[PDB]
Design a protein around this nucleic acid. Structure first.
Length: 14
RNA sequence: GGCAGAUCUGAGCCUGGGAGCUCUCUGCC
């Protein structure tokens, strides 16, 4: 899974 | 025991730009 944080996408798990 | 939302990060930090450390509020079966 995917999250937007502070100018960018990060991935955490799927 | 399992899937997913918040968002100008809802938010601390780094042995950072990493399927990283972390941290809060909630749903569904």
């Amino acid at each position: 899974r995917v999250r937007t944080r502070k100018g960018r996408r990060i991935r955490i798990x799927p």
